[PDB]
């Protein structure tokens, strides 16, 4: 029986059908050596074009021969897939319109929920599955770091056979993105393939932000600056990220994408202005610095070289007022407990069940030189506290926007929510 070396057993993602994005079932490998599941072969090849959906090679003769002999399936590959992914196969076992656009887009959306990529998010704007909104954060290794960029995705009716149309809604200073948000990227036009996904497109866009292609520009002036005055390009990129993409300008740490994600949990249909987001970022940075500094002193005074979740917990009690401290302590403890009792995951935040960045918080705790060593639980606890406080502030700020007949949180709604809440005013009144 066909067996593979263990190192060469294909992953689940490598066993997906390039057309429907479901697991390959009864895989049909065409003479061009491109594969698709039998339902997709029946719907897109046998019934209609009689051509390979990937390379357009004709396969009518091949199909005639092997349909008569019931030898369309690649039994060697089918054996391997059934052996290593039997449950995924079982869910497709009892079935005969595979390959349709609506099904493919829905499958990609479901896949995103199970496996989000690199702090990106994408989903339907309303009830039209063919129109999506996407959110990407500016890569850390780029002058867009800390920014939140919104994009629109328009799926064509014959997706995945034609590429999706992706454009920036947020203004950005980039040689390959113009004032309308049009993107010059190979994956969107010349190098599109039905097996590519929105996830891979967003990852490719993030990589473009890290490393532009100045030799094929949409804005020649920006490419010229990138090629002759990189410092000026970086400076202007950072400035635009602050002006339009909720950046910090590069001086302070940005949490805008995490604030936004928390906001969508407590108030899905409510937005936040850039000025208000700058205030939210000032709170998080100040709370971080107050807790981290207190924990630094608690480790030193007690002759401990490490800041652990115990110093974080004590610092929270010392710095926050009663009920806020009690809930924060409960949230940080819950996150450290969940983190310790969970498997290593894609991100430490996911292992802790948090939106805020555990890994980044840990890096900041070490970069600030608050102590010689920082335990793994400290950033989990601290990130959970910052997330809880952000959630409590956005909860009240959103309630102030609803009461004011507004759908967008602005500084007025934040200053109102904080002043009206006794404990929050005591915690943040001086920061404002
Ligand atoms: Cl095997
Ligand atoms: Cl082996
Ligand atoms: Cl079978
Ligand atoms: Cl042929
Ligand atoms: Cl067959
Ligand atoms: Cl399985
Ligand atoms: Cl920079
Ligand atoms: Cl332009
Ligand atoms: Cl466009
Ligand atoms: Cl130009
Ligand atoms: Cl304590
Ligand atoms: Cl991580
Ligand atoms: Cl980092
Ligand atoms: Cl680190
Ligand atoms: Cl860093
Ligand atoms: Cl720890
Ligand atoms: Na971050
Ligand atoms: Zn398929
Ligand atoms: Zn082919």
UniProtKB/Swiss-Prot annotation:
Membrane topology recorded in Swiss-Prot or TrEMBL: Peripheral membrane protein
Tell me the disulfide pairings in this chain.
120-206
PTM comment: the record says:
Phosphorylated by AURKB.
List the Gene Ontology MF annotations in alphabetical order: ATP binding; ubiquitin conjugating enzyme activity; ubiquitin protein ligase activity; ubiquitin-protein transferase activity
User: In which pathway does this enzyme or protein participate?
Assistant: Protein modification; protein ubiquitination
> What GO terms in the biological process aspect are recorded for it?
apoptotic process; DNA repair; negative regulation of BMP signaling pathway; negative regulation of transcription by RNA polymerase II; positive regulation of protein targeting to mitochondrion; proteasome-mediated ubiquitin-dependent protein catabolic process; protein autoubiquitination; protein K11-linked ubiquitination
Instruction: Please give the annotated consequence of changing residue 184 to A.
Output: Loss of function
Q: Does the keyword Transferase apply?
A: yes
Q: What is the effect of changing residue 186 to N?
A: Does not affect lysine reactivity
Q: How does it assemble?
A: Interacts with SCF (SKP1-CUL1-F-box protein) E3 ubiquitin ligase complex; when Cullin is neddylated, the interaction between the E2 and the SCF complex is strengthened. Interacts with DAPK3. Interacts with BRCA1; the DNA damage checkpoint promotes the association with BRCA1 after ionizing radiation. Interacts non-covalently with ubiquitin. Interacts with E3 ubiquitin-protein ligase CBLC. Interacts with UBTD1. Interacts with RIGI and RNF135; involved in RIGI ubiquitination and activation.
The name this protein goes by in its record: Ubiquitin-conjugating enzyme E2 D3
Q: List the source organism.
A: Homo sapiens
Q: Where is the organism placed in the taxonomic lineage, from the top? A: Eukaryota, Metazoa, Chordata, Craniata, Vertebrata
């Amino acid at each position: 029986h066909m067996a593979l070396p263990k190192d060469a057993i294909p992953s689940l993602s490598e066993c997906q059908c390039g057309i429907c994005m479901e697991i390959l079932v009864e895989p049909v490998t065409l003479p061009c050596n491109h594969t698709l599941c039998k339902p997709c072969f029946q719907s897109t090849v046998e019934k209609a074009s009689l051509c390979c959906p990937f390379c357009r090679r004709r396969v009518s003769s091949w199909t005639r021969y092997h349909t008569r002999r019931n030898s369309l399936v690649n039994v060697e590959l089918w054996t391997i897939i059934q052996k290593h992914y039997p449950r995924e196969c079982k869910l497709r076992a009892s079935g005969s319109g595979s390959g349709s656009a609506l099904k493919r887009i829905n499958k990609e959306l479901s896949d995103l929920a199970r496996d989000p990529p690199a702090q990106c998010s994408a989903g339907p704007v309303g009830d039209d599955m063919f129109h999506w909104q996407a959110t990407i954060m500016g890569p850390n290794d780029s002058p867009y770091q800390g920014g939140v960029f919104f994009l629109t995705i328009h799926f064509p009716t014959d997706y995945p056979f034609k590429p999706p149309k992706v454009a920036f809604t947020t203004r950005i200073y980039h040689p390959n993105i113009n004032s309308n948000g049009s993107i010059c990227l190979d994956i969107l036009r010349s190098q599109w393939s039905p097996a590519l996904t929105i996830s891979k497109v967003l990852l490719s866009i993030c990589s473009l932000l890290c490393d532009p292609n100045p030799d094929d520009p949409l804005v020649p002036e920006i490419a010229r600056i990138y090629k002759t005055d990189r410092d000026k390009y970086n400076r202007i990129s950072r400035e635009w990220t602050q002006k339009y993409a909720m950046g910090s300008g590069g001086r302070k740490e940005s949490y805008s994408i995490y604030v936004y994600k928390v906001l969508k949990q407590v108030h899905p249909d409510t937005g936040i202005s850039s000025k208000a987001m700058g205030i939210m970022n000032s709170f998080v940075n100040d709370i971080f610095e107050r807790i981290a500094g207190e924990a630094s002193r608690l480790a030193h005074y007690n002759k401990r070289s490490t800041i652990t979740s115990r110093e974080i917990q004590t610092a929270v009690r010392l710095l926050l007022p009663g009920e806020l401290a009690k809930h924060a302590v409960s949230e940080g403890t819950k996150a450290v407990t969940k983190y310790t009792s969970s498997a290593k995951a894609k991100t430490r935040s996911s292992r802790a069940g948090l939106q805020f960045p555990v890994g980044r918080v840990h890096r900041l705790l070490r970069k600030g030189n608050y102590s010689e060593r920082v335990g793994a639980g400290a950033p989990v606890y601290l990130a959970a506290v910052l997330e809880y406080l952000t959630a409590e502030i956005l909860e009240l700020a959103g309630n102030a926007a609803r009461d004011n007949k507004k759908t967008r949180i602005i500084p007025r709604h934040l200053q109102l929510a904080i002043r009206n809440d006794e404990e929050l005013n005591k915690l943040l009144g001086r920061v404002t």
